[PDB]
Amino acid sequence: NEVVTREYTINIHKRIHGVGFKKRAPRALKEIRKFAMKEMGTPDVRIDTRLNKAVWAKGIRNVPYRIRVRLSRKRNEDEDSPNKLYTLVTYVPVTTFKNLQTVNVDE
Amino acid sequence: SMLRLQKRLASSVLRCGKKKVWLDPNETNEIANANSCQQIRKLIKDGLIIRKPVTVHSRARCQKNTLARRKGRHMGIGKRKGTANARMPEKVKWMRR
Amino acid sequence: SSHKTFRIKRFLAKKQKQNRPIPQWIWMKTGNKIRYNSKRRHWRRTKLGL
RNA sequence: CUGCUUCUGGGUCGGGGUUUCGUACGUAGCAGAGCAGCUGCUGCGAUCUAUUGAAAGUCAGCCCUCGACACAAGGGUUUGU
RNA sequence: CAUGUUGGAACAAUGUAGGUAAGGGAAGUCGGCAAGCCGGAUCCGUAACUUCGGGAUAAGGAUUGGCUCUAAGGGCUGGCAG
RNA sequence: CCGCCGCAGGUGCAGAUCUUGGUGGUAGUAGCAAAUAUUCAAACGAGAACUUUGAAGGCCGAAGUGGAGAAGGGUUCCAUG
């Protein structure tokens, strides 16, 4: 119920539309963080180093239009922020987004 | 917490730039209490501080292009920016002759 | 500069030794008026002449 | 200016519709100026032809979904004749 | 090296700094100011005037990519081969 | 410290674009816009847009934002707190 992991394709292209060249990739990280808070209501969204890398792969201006993302709500580690759970947003390499549904991947 | 003393020393001992000093981010606190070059030379032997390899500047497409230049490709009339004299001077042609 | 005369390096020596704060037992003396050293001199602010 | 359970609702993604651009990569070809080798085969070769009105983008302030996916009967501050 | 002594969020007007504009083309303006045109190299071609030095990149044209070839221009060693 | 009788004067401030010191309104305002750009994770820590480490994306581009010096500075060097 709480340790839930779900696949998602995030249309970055329609969350980045009209932002300036030197703020596209920085903004793309902030809508993937909003996307985590929205689907899995956790303020503590920790976004994987490889997903950062994946967004920045084409540089600051050019960003992947769609990125596949594993979104995993988990039990928080010790020295607790009052946020009971956090979301770990992990990159999933994909060759085609054509006919990719949101899948409830299981433990 | 602060490894500036130990990245500076590591750069001096490796005889490289501090650009190329890799400090193991996992064993940070064991690098932290180095404080001397002799202590850092141990962490080079232990392979905790490592010289990063040189960022590659391959001149392979340079060679591929220079091989085309040898056959007269890319050397046409609309690729000549300096004068015929500037490119290959008449005084050097004469000297040769 | 790096190249100095002996005369200037003795001048610069005295000015260094004058640039220390008062000892914390000087204000415990009977007729103390000194709170802190007023004649302190930072190397950006006041440029020591020359 | 709007929306926030008539078992319904917006939202995310997907899929169609529209549309922009002009025919993707890969593979195939006794298409290709010619050239090199080996006794016709084999290479190197811009480009060309088919696959291919292909590929790619398309609401972020396009249209349509009843296909997936979670979410939604809350929280806060006030108001009395 | 961390964007020059701060970030965050929006993308109104006025700026400042960049662009682009149908048809016309200086009608604008004190004035083509500003902007734009022009630009490299090769091959042509080049006037008035002149102190014969120039003017001169005068003006005015053509060509320029990629690719596959062809020809020409050399050393070394015992009209030649290697 | 003062009343009375005398004595004496550097003896009465609203101004002098007065002097010195203090404080307003302006006003939480102008502003914190020259030289392209940051991002993710971790660590220390009461506390992190800015510190440090790692990873990414960038910039200077050898007439350098590089490595050394002369003038000038004078301890700014270095470690620890």
UniProtKB/Swiss-Prot annotation, chain A:
It holds the Pfam family Ribosomal_L31e. Gene3D superfamilies: 3.10.440.10. The modification N6-succinyllysine is found at K38, K53, K58. Keywords: Acetylation, Cytoplasm, Phosphoprotein, Ribonucleoprotein, Ribosomal protein. The modification Phosphoserine is found at S81. GO terms for cellular component: cytosolic large ribosomal subunit. The modification N6-acetyllysine is found at K58. It comes from the Eukaryota. SMART domains: Ribosomal_L31e (SM01380). The keyword Cytoplasm applies. GO terms for molecular function: structural constituent of ribosome. GO terms for biological process: cytoplasmic translation. It is found in: Cytoplasm. Component of the large ribosomal subunit. Belongs to the eukaryotic ribosomal protein eL31 family. PANTHER family: 60S RIBOSOMAL PROTEIN L31. Component of the large ribosomal subunit. The ribosome is a large ribonucleoprotein complex responsible for the synthesis of proteins in the cell. This is Large ribosomal subunit protein eL31. It comes from Oryctolagus cuniculus.
